[PDB]
């Protein structure tokens, strides 16, 4: 730790109070090792975050983004993420990538960087693996503790992680699929119709916003399609839709169906205007 007793970040930050988005600065950027120039942004008081934010820095923040590539599909490249800016993207997404180096060895730091992945910088990725950690700690447990977690989680999350579109949808139905299925198993039948309640208004609003969605489907599954969003492996909305159905049968009559789908739309016209 000659890094932290020299403290790179402080010195970092004081140079950027110094003397703004300079060429100086933006050298010094340039050659922070990823993890640190994420953690740099994650972590710095409203002052430096905002010259972080500034229109002067987007270049630099643009070439990083573009410079982002796959382990194994080398031609994949990420397409601009729509509200989220590509600053953003890309330190959650290097966060999320040094989550998953300390998953096996150390999964300590594990936790701690996929927290700040997801809550700092949104990072669908670091949605997505948290909801498979919580999700699959149910299956292993079924108890009355870890499913009210889940559902606790979801139900906080569910706004910031609709602002992925369709892929986030997806996210948050599979989840609560997931939640109406343990509920069940429990008794809890309540609670479970309320689960697939909400998965069918979220598979609505997915349908909704999928046009509008390309460039995060291509982000969010590399490429792949929609397959791996469901656990039916389906690409169609549509066909989700019926495989939820057959198997939620009487907790969704369609005066139900109708009610989410109409909360779907509300949704849509009211904050996905454009």
Same mark, same amino acid.
Request: aromatic content about 12%; charged content about 25%; glycine content about 4%.
């Given at each position: 730790?000659? /890094?932290?007793?020299?403290?790179?970040?402080?010195?970092?930050?004081?140079?950027?109070?110094? =003397?703004?988005?300079?060429?100086? @600065?933006?050298?010094?950027?340039?050659?922070?090792?990823?993890?640190?120039?994420?953690?740099?942004?994650?972590?710095?008081?409203?002052?430096? !975050?905002?010259?972080?934010?500034?229109? =002067?820095?987007?270049?630099?923040?643009?070439?990083?983004?573009? /410079?982002?590539?796959?382990? /194994?599909?080398?031609?994949?490249?990420?397409?601009?993420?729509?509200?989220?800016?590509?600053?953003?993207?890309?330190?959650?997404?290097?966060?999320?990538? *040094? +989550?998953?180096? &300390?998953?096996? !060895?150390?999964?300590?730091?594990?936790?701690?960087?996929?927290?700040?992945?997801?809550?700092?910088? #949104?990072?669908?990725?670091? *949605? $997505?693996?948290?909801?498979?950690?919580?999700?699959?700690?149910?299956?292993?447990?079924?108890?009355?503790?870890?499913?009210?977690?889940?559902? #606790?989680? @979801?139900?906080? $999350?569910?706004?910031?992680?609709? &602002?992925?579109k369709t892929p986030g949808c997806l996210?948050?139905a599979? +989840?609560?699929?997931?939640?109406?299925?343990?509920?069940?198993?429990?008794?809890?039948? %309540?609670?479970?119709?309320?689960?697939?309640? &909400?998965?069918?208004?979220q598979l609505h609003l997915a349908q909704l916003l999928e046009?509008?969605s =390309?460039?995060?489907?291509?982000?969010?599954?590399?490429?792949?399609?929609? +397959?791996?969003?469901? %656990?039916?492996?389906?690409?169609?909305i549509?066909?989700?839709?019926?495989?939820?159905?057959?198997?939620?049968? &009487? %907790?969704?009559?369609?005066? *139900?169906?109708?009610?989410?789908?109409? #909360? *779907?739309?509300?949704?849509?016209?009211?904050?996905? !205007?454009?």
């Open positions: 730790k000659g /890094k932290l007793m020299p403290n790179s970040l402080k010195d970092v930050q004081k140079l950027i109070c110094d =003397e703004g988005i300079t060429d100086n @600065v933006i050298t010094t950027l340039s050659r922070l090792k990823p993890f640190d120039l994420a953690m740099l942004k994650a972590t710095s008081d409203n002052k430096v !975050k905002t010259l972080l934010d500034s229109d =002067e820095l987007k270049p630099f923040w643009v070439n990083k983004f573009n /410079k982002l590539r796959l382990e /194994k599909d080398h031609i994949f490249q990420f397409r601009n993420p729509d509200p989220q800016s590509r600053a953003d993207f890309y330190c959650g997404y290097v966060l999320y990538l *040094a +989550a998953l180096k &300390e998953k096996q !060895k150390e999964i300590s730091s594990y936790y701690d960087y996929l927290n700040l992945s997801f809550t700092t910088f #949104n990072c669908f990725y670091a *949605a $997505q693996e948290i909801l498979t950690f919580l999700i699959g700690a149910c299956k292993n447990d079924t108890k009355r503790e870890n499913i009210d977690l889940l559902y #606790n989680f @979801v139900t906080s $999350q569910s706004t910031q992680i609709q &602002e992925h996210l948050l599979n +989840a609560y699929f997931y939640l109406a299925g343990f509920y069940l198993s429990l008794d809890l039948k %309540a609670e479970s119709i309320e689960c697939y309640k &909400e998965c069918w208004g046009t509008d =390309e460039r995060e489907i291509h982000n969010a599954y590399f490429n792949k399609g929609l +397959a791996t969003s469901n %656990a039916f492996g389906l690409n169609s549509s066909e989700i839709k019926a495989r939820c159905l057959d198997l939620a049968s &009487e %907790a969704l009559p369609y005066p *139900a169906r109708n009610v989410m789908e109409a #909360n *779907a739309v509300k949704t849509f016209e009211n904050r996905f !205007k454009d």
